[PDB]
C-alpha cells in the first residue's frame, strides 16, 4: 500500500539529495595531509635570499642604489626625489604636478616630439608621479640600452626647457584632468579626508591644488621650485634588473652635475609647520547617488615609528572585503565576516597611510544608503575589539598575510627599483627581508593591544562622507564608539 520512492516526485528528489549528501560524507586523507586551516608561524629564512642592494653616496650627497640580477634582460632606472605637494608654500600648491607634466615635454635638445619618438624607438617606457611628499621619475628599458635611459633622465631632470605654448597646452590638459577626477569618488573622499584631518597644515592641501593657482604658473614658480627642491641630497637613483652598480655609479657621476646645490633640507622644513591631526568631519549629502561612500580615520604612525609594522598588521586583520570576493562569508577578519554575512556594504577597505611624523588608519566603507548605521556599528565594533580582545590565531593569520602580501607585491624589476627608492627615502636604508620578517614576527597579541590602546582607544576620529548619508551616524556616535564600557 505505501508507495515506493520511485513515484512521488518529492520522494525522488529527497532520495537524490540524500544520495549526494551521503556521497560527500566520507573524506580522504591523501588530500588532507597538508591543509591545516589553523594558521601558524614559519621560518622562511631558507627562502629569503635576494641579491645585495649595493648603495653608494657620491660626495655631492647623491645616493645611488642597485639590486643587480645580470641573468635578466630588462631593467628599471629611476629617480626618487624627496619632494612633493606637502613642501609647497600655500600659493604654489599645484607646482609639483604641473612640473611633472611639463618635465615630460622638452629640454634644450630633446624636442618633445622627437623625445617621445626616441623613447618609443628604443622600446622602453617612461613614467612619473608625485605623492604628497615623494616624487618619482622612472623608465623601464632593456639591457645594453639602459645607458640611453639614464642619460635621458639626467637631461630632463637638469636641462629641461619650459616654453609658453606647451605651458598653455598643459594648463588645458591639467584642467581637463581636474575635471575628470570627480568621477573617481574614492580619490575625492581621500582628498577631503586629508583636508579635514590635517587642516591648516601642509598635508591638508591636495596634490593637484586649486585651478585658480594652476592658472598663474608663469614658469618662474616652476624654475624656483625645481632649483629649491631638486637638490642633490634629496634625490636617489635606483636600478634593478640587468644593471651593473659600477657602471651606474660612473654614469650618474658623469651626468648628474648641473644640479641645484642648496640647503633646503626636508627634515628642517618639516621641523617648521609640522602635521597636526584635528578630529573633524565633512559630509557632502547628495541623495541623487546610488551609493554612499565614507571613510573614518585615526591618527597613524610615521615612517620610522616602530609601531608602523604593528599598524600594518592591524590593517591586515581588518582586511578588505568586496562583493565579488572569492571567500565571501568565510574570511579571516571579523569585519569581513560581519560585512559579508549580513551584506551591509558593497565593499570595505582598511587603509594604513604613513607620512613623516604622522599618518592615517581607517576602514573606507562603501555601501547602500539604508545599511549605513549597521555598517558603522560593525566597523567601530571591530576596531575597538582590536583595542580590547585580540586573538592569537587572528594575529598569526594577519602576520602571515602581511609577509605574503609584501613579498608577492615585490615582483619584477620596476617593483624592486620602486621598493629600493621608497625605502631609501623613508628609512634611509633598504630593510632586508629577514629583518622585516623578524620585525613582523615580533608582533603578538600583547603588541597589538598596546598599539591599539595607543592609537585607537578614546582618540578623535576624522570622517569624510559623500552621497546619500541620512542614516550615517553623527560624529558623537563614532567618538563614543571608540571605547567600551564593559571592560
Amino acid at each position: 500500500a505505501p508507495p515506493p520512492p520511485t513515484a512521488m516526485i518529492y520522494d525522488r528528489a529527497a532520495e537524490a539529495i540524500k544520495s549526494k549528501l551521503r556521497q560527500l560524507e566520507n573524506p580522504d586523507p591523501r588530500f588532507l595531509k597538508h591543509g591545516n586551516p589553523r594558521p601558524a608561524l614559519s621560518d622562511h629564512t631558507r627562502i629569503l635570499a635576494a641579491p645585495e642592494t649595493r648603495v653608494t653616496t657620491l660626495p655631492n650627497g647623491l645616493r645611488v642604489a642597485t639590486e643587480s640580477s645580470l641573468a635578466a634582460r630588462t631593467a628599471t632606472v629611476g629617480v626618487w626625489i624627496d619632494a612633493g605637494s606637502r613642501f609647497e608654500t600655500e600659493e604654489t600648491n599645484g607646482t609639483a604636478h604641473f612640473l611633472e607634466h611639463m618635465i615630460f615635454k622638452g629640454t634644450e635638445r630633446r624636442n618633445a616630439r622627437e623625445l617621445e619618438e626616441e623613447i618609443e624607438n628604443m622600446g622602453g617606457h617612461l613614467n612619473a608621479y608625485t605623492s604628497r611628499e615623494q616624487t618619482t621619475y622612472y623608465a623601464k628599458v632593456t639591457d645594453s640600452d639602459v645607458p640611453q635611459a639614464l642619460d635621458i633622465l639626467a637631461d630632463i631632470l637638469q636641462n629641461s626647457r619650459f616654453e609658453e605654448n606647451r605651458i598653455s597646452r598643459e594648463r588645458d590638459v591639467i584642467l581637463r584632468e581636474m575635471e575628470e577626477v570627480e568621477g573617481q569618488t574614492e580619490e575625492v573622499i581621500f582628498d577631503h579626508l586629508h583636508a579635514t584631518a590635517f587642516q591648516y597644515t601642509p598635508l591638508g592641501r591636495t596634490i593637484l591644488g586649486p585651478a585658480q593657482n594652476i592658472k598663474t604658473i608663469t614658469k618662474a614658480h616652476l624654475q624656483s621650485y625645481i632649483q629649491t627642491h631638486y637638490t642633490a641630497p634629496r634625490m636617489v637613483i635606483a636600478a634593478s634588473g640587468a644593471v651593473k652598480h659600477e657602471d651606474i655609479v660612473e654614469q650618474v657621476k658623469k651626468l648628474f652635475t648641473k644640479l641645484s646645490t642648496d640647503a633646503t633640507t626636508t627634515a628642517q622644513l618639516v621641523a617648521k609647520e609640522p602635521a597636526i591631526f584635528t578630529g573633524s568631519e565633512v559630509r557632502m549629502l547628495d541623495d541623487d547617488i546610488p551609493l554612499a561612500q565614507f571613510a573614518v580615520a585615526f591618527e597613524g604612525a610615521s615612517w620610522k615609528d616602530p609601531d608602523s609594522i604593528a599598524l600594518m598588521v592591524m590593517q591586515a586583520m581588518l582586511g578588505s572585503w568586496n562583493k565579488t570576493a572569492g571567500g565571501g562569508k568565510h574570511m579571516g577578519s571579523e569585519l569581513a565576516q560581519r560585512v559579508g554575512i549580513n551584506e551591509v556594504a558593497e565593499s570595505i577597505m582598511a587603509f594604513n597611510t604613513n607620512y613623516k611624523d604622522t599618518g592615517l588608519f581607517g576602514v573606507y566603507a562603501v555601501a547602500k544608503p539604508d545599511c549605513l548605521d549597521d555598517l558603522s556599528y560593525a566597523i567601530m565594533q571591530e576596531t575597538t575589539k582590536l583595542v580590547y580582545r585580540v586573538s592569537e590565531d587572528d594575529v598569526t593569520r594577519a602576520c602571515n598575510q602581511l609577509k605574503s602580501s609584501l613579498l608577492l607585491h615585490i615582483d619584477g624589476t620596476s617593483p624592486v627599483a620602486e621598493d629600493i627608492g621608497r625605502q631609501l627615502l623613508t628609512y634611509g636604508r633598504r630593510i632586508p627581508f629577514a629583518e622585516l620578517f623578524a620585525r613582523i614576527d615580533a608582533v603578538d597579541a600583547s603588541t597589538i593591544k598596546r598599539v591599539a590602546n595607543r592609537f585607537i582607544y578614546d582618540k578623535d576620529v576624522a570622517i569624510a562622507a559623500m552621497g546619500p548619508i541620512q542614516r550615517l551616524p553623527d560624529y558623537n556616535w563614532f567618538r563614543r564608539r571608540t571605547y567600551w564600557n564593559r571592560y
Binding site: 505505501p2 520512492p5 516526485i9 518529492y10 540524500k18 549528501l21 571579523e334 565576516q337
Partner: protein, 116 residues
C-alpha cells in the same frame, strides 16, 4: 547504548505507537522539526529542494486542517502513509557539522537567534 526496535521490545512498542500517531495525522516524523525552534532546521530547509519543502508544507497543512476538524485521515491514505521515511536528517547533520567546524576554528556564527 543504542536501542533499536529489532533488539528491544520496548523500543518496538514505542516505534509502533509513534507510527500509529503519525499515520493518523498523516505527516512524517521530520515534519515535526520547527524551523523557528533551532535555526539549523531553518538552514537545512533552505538547502533542500523546492519539491520536498513544498510537500512538507502540504503535509503540515493537511495535518493542521485535520486537527481543526477533529478527525483523522481516512483509512485508505492511513494505510498509504510512510512515516520515518526521512528527508531532512542528513542535511541537518551536515549543517550542524559545518557549524561545529566553523565554531571550532575561529569563525563567527553564520546566523544567530534574536533576543528573544
Amino acid at each position: 547504548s543504542f536501542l533499536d526496535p529489532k533488539k528491544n521490545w520496548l523500543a518496538a512498542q514505542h516505534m509502533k505507537s509513534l507510527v500509529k500517531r503519525l499515520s493518523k495525522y498523516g505527516l512524517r516524523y521530520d515534519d515535526l522539526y520547527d524551523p523557528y525552534y533551532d535555526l539549523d532546521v531553518k538552514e537545512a530547509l533552505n538547502r533542500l529542494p523546492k519539491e520536498v519543502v513544498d510537500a512538507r508544507h502540504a503535509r503540515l497543512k493537511r495535518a493542521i486542517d485535520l486537527s481543526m476538524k477533529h478527525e483523522y485521515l481516512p483509512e485508505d491514505l492511513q494505510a498509504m502513509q510512510t512515516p520515518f521515511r526521512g528527508y531532512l536528517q542528513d542535511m541537518l547533520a551536515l549543517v550542524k557539522r559545518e557549524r561545529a567546524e566553523r565554531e571550532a576554528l575561529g569563525g563567527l556564527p553564520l546566523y544567530q537567534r534574536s533576543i528573544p
